[PDB]
Amino acid sequence: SNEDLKLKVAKEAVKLVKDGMVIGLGTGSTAALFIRELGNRIREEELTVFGIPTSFEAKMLAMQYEIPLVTLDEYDVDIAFDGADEVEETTLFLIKGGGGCHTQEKIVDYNANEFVVLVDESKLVKKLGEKFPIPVEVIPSAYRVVIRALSEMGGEAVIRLGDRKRGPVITDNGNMIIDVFMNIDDAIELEKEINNIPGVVENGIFTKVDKVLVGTKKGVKTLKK
Amino acid sequence: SNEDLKLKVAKEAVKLVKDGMVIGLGTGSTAALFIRELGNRIREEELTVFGIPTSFEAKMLAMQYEIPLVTLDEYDVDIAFDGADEVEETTLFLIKGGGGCHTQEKIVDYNANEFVVLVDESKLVKKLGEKFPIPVEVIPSAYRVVIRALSEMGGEAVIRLGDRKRGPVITDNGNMIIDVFMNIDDAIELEKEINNIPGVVENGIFTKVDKVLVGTKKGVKTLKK
């Protein structure tokens, strides 16, 4: 699972943090390494830096690494750092939500002044959604009719089931997750269309990325449109 | 308040129900009268009719009037009956969610085989949203950034505060409500764009309807197309 490349991008990403910044703390294994680096760098350099978490996980990690936490209802974010399940090469469109936290991730990431994605090179894809389903957070009363709508749109949609709870996985917001495989022609339009299905709260297509840091065997390349 | 006209429309609407149907049970004063009529009809004619609620209000009234409730996750709705805050005369577009329940309302109403709106004549308007704000259900962590997005779209947005609970009104789904006055040029497109703001769950613009029953002093008229 490319941990050395993940750590490499985390250590490079943390250099972008400046004293006085409010930083969005992403979710997933790559973000988690970044949160540890930020925690270290805050302590060792006596920085005044606050974090806004994108999940209970990010919140609990921040606490462990002693990053002061604030909320988006109180502060704007200077830079949001987050991972991705896929990054489309030519567009820098993402699929996120493998970890079931795409809703709070999007809220922070799209609202930050800058949104930086942190990935190892294996996340790069030629075609978004070819090999990874789109996560969709759904109001529980609407699961059947959202599966219908997604199926009408050409998707193969399945409810995400839990490993440590019986039945559907539940998000930090109390909703279910449907994962849907789609042939994505126009990712911007598809993101809009899925969100307009009654019962859909948010989906894992991200189309507003400022830049992508990619850990490779050679180093860290930056991608920007 | 037009109670006479509301009762008239409810009494006429209940005649559309056929034995064996699953009926969507709307929310608000007019839908409440309909639920009473439906319960009375089920009793007096011994119909086998089930209901699917759009709110905890609808669930409680169904209990009170002995309408057996099933779930949208198992059954499609033959006819959904619901109220509206505004019905635009030329388009039959609606604003709903004055009572805070537009999200579950839309899940039921848009998915019903037939969606029938029940209003008294006072709800008819020349221009949608000229005199009533659009309810928007919002993930609580996102309220500040959603207010910003709505303001940047030209809206006057205010968080709805409560009287029987201190602070923000909370929906049946656990979220907050922002009410936003907007100049609605293209209702179909605005509905879509509001839903694509991160942190927005659903909004009160409704642009799909089968027919609108309107209680007037001379009787109930049916609007369609």
Add this chain to the structure above:
Amino acid sequence: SNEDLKLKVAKEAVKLVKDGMVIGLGTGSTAALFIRELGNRIREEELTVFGIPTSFEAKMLAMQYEIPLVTLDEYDVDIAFDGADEVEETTLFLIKGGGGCHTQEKIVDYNANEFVVLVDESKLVKKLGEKFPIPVEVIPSAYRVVIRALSEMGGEAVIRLGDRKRGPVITDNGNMIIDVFMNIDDAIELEKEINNIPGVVENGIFTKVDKVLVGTKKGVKTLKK
């Protein structure tokens, strides 16, 4: 995982269902097998039987096996069937909530006219909670202070984390789960005390049951008192 003994108990349990009943549908592998048997019986005998689910799992299985679902807010349950993580041999006290659904389970199971536990023989224990921790559903804001409370009570408490969603496991009600090992010397009082910790929603000690059906190699035995 004793699938023969679980299937055996499910097949015997379904015989207790009578035409016209409302049946509580439990959660977990043994309950799932019962739900299938029930659906088969309803179909092959053309029974008029309704279900009330204890979880999103039970809801989905009821859909799959064509059991019409109603609500506890409208109907009482004739017989609730559910599984257990442990059944104490002398008292028939249980631990439930291994699958994270103990809160809704307890709501249904304690209120049913008859509550029937279904287990294979491996679930029988000499001492409740010696080898299995008590699940505790917790308001997220409270997890730290609940860990403290449970520790004061002599428990070793740990937040349940997931792998299909990053971070804490979230219940069907949107809360967290703390699992706590305790030396249980009065189950009835411990259940009551845990529930009086601020931030605790419900716990997995069950001290009310009508009978326990146990699948053994020599047949299904029935335990009571």
Add this chain to the structure above:
Amino acid sequence: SNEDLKLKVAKEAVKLVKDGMVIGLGTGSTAALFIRELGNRIREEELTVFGIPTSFEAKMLAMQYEIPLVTLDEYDVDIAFDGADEVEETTLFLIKGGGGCHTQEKIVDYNANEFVVLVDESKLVKKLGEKFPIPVEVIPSAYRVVIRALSEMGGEAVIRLGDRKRGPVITDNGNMIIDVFMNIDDAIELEKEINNIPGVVENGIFTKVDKVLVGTKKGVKTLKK
């Protein structure tokens, strides 16, 4: 409604705050005045004091008066300040939850090193629960069986309905509120018994106060012991 008395208690209460403390920020009109006073004192004396909110209201007010906010999952509370609907004179037992926020209030207030209640003189009563119902926060699926349980206990239990939303008032936690009139013979035991009803999250009886500051025409008096 005794506004000058509330103000005078708030002004006296704020003197109890010391630099470096973490303070619990209560809910309701009297607490809101306290929050204003605290915000003023933090700014004017350049205190390093943090607040932990007991509601979305308290969080919103803190932000408005620029009190830095932390969470109970991160920090313990030195002093929690909160209001009350009733304060029984001889015992200092309280009823809280008039504003629908008793659950988060109890989580903070019971966990504080010191819990201070702020009331005007009109909140003092001879007998707890004689003139005011006990708020009870209830899992929505359980409202009928919880009404039943409370009624079996001798209570007159009624669902609290909203005025700025249709149907049941919903808490910050996404649950319903049932208000129940009871003849309270043993408050400590009743608090425990109500909490052990399946589907009850928390109730408004509070039995653990350190002191009560009372606003009277003459001044502010401290009740303790």
